[PDB]
Amino acid sequence: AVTITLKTLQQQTFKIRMEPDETVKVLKEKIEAEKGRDAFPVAGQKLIYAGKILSDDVPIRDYRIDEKNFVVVMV
Amino acid sequence: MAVTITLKTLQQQTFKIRMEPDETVKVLKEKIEAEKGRDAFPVAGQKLIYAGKILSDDVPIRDYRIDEKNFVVVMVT
Amino acid sequence: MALVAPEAPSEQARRVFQTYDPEDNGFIPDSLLEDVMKALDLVSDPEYINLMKNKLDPEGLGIILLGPFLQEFFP
Amino acid sequence: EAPSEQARRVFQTYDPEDNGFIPDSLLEDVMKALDLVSDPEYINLMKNKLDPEGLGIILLGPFLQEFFP
């Protein structure tokens, strides 16, 4: 029951909820459902947390992302 | 904002040091030396451990997020 | 690989701990604390480890539980 | 030896400051260490039994009474 905060390179902010065990790949899928496959296709997504790139197969709980900071989604 | 840091030696003593969160580890060692003596706790021989990690002289003490109910271990080497 | 985001230290520690606990007891014998701290690059001076044994296992149960271990080393 | 005696010692290990209680986030840890059922829904139900007011803490007394009557 965790909430990720996402910023795009168009100064847009938004929130995605997922379970701790769901992977970065599923975060990308949820971003795509929320923002569209035209502009945020899963394949083209790079998720950047604290200046480094999140890895598709890793459960999100494993990064211990504080809800204070944000994840940047780049394409 | 002052933090009271409890120190424990590995030959079984305890004492406390008051200092400001922006002051560095180097200042903590200097306060330990003034408190316990240059003879037995010279600054250059002090090695300070918190959360199983060695504290670095140039680092503001706040970065280690020291809990007042915990303690820093002092090793003299 | 230089840009790959790293695991949170607490989650790496959880993984190590569970690995030393193949029966999922929730704890390790306190004789394994040294090995677990060395595997996690924590200070392993013998007398320091004996202070940590006593901080973590004040009741003298002879075991190190995961909760207290993470709380001391990876809060 | 009464299992309650070991339960007290395990509980005290999660409460090294002798508050007499633990954050309810550690109830799962304690129940696991004591070989008590730890299905997430069972944990949640017993949380509400032990902490009916929603303070977020588990007191030692009610803990021992629920699992070692």
Swiss-Prot record, chain A:
Changing residue 46 to E: Impairs UBL-UBA domain interaction and enhances ubiquitin-binding. Changing residue 46 to E: Impairs UBL-UBA domain interaction and enhances ubiquitin-binding. Residues 1-75 form the Ubiquitin-like domain. Transmembrane segments: none annotated. It comes from the Eukaryota. Changing residue 48 to A: Impairs interaction with PSMD4. It is found in: Nucleus. Disulfide bonds: none annotated. Belongs to the RAD23 family. The ubiquitin-like domain mediates interaction with ATXN3. The ubiquitin-like (UBL) and the UBA (ubiquitin-associated) domains interact intramolecularly in a highly dynamic manner, as each UBA domain competes for an overlapping UBL domain surface. Binding of ubiquitin or proteasome subunit PSMD4 disrupt the UBL-UBA domain interactions and drive RAD23A in to an open conformation. Multiubiquitin chain receptor involved in modulation of proteasomal degradation. Binds to 'Lys-48'-linked polyubiquitin chains in a length-dependent manner and with a lower affinity to 'Lys-63'-linked polyubiquitin chains. Proposed to be capable to bind simultaneously to the 26S proteasome and to polyubiquitinated substrates and to deliver ubiquitinated proteins to the proteasome. Interacts with XPC; the interaction is suggesting the existence of a functional equivalent variant XPC complex. Interacts with PSMD4 and PSMC5. Interacts with ATXN3. Interacts with UBQLN2. This is UV excision repair protein RAD23 homolog A. The chain holds residues 2 to 76 of 363 of the full protein.
UniProtKB/Swiss-Prot annotation, chain B:
Changing residue 77 to E: Impairs UBL-UBA domain interaction and enhances ubiquitin-binding. Signal peptide: none annotated. Residues 1-77 form the Ubiquitin-like domain. Changing residue 9 to A: Abolishes interaction with PSMD4. It is found in: Nucleus. Changing residue 47 to E: Impairs UBL-UBA domain interaction and enhances ubiquitin-binding. Changing residue 54 to A: Impairs interaction with PSMD4. Changing residue 10 to E: Impairs UBL-UBA domain interaction and enhances ubiquitin-binding. Transmembrane segments: none annotated. The ubiquitin-like domain mediates interaction with ATXN3. The ubiquitin-like (UBL) and the UBA (ubiquitin-associated) domains interact intramolecularly in a highly dynamic manner, as each UBA domain competes for an overlapping UBL domain surface. Binding of ubiquitin or proteasome subunit PSMD4 disrupt the UBL-UBA domain interactions and drive RAD23A in to an open conformation. Interacts with XPC; the interaction is suggesting the existence of a functional equivalent variant XPC complex. Interacts with PSMD4 and PSMC5. Interacts with ATXN3. Interacts with UBQLN2. (Microbial infection) Interacts with HIV-1 Vpr. Multiubiquitin chain receptor involved in modulation of proteasomal degradation. Binds to 'Lys-48'-linked polyubiquitin chains in a length-dependent manner and with a lower affinity to 'Lys-63'-linked polyubiquitin chains. Proposed to be capable to bind simultaneously to the 26S proteasome and to polyubiquitinated substrates and to deliver ubiquitinated proteins to the proteasome. Belongs to the RAD23 family. This is UV excision repair protein RAD23 homolog A.
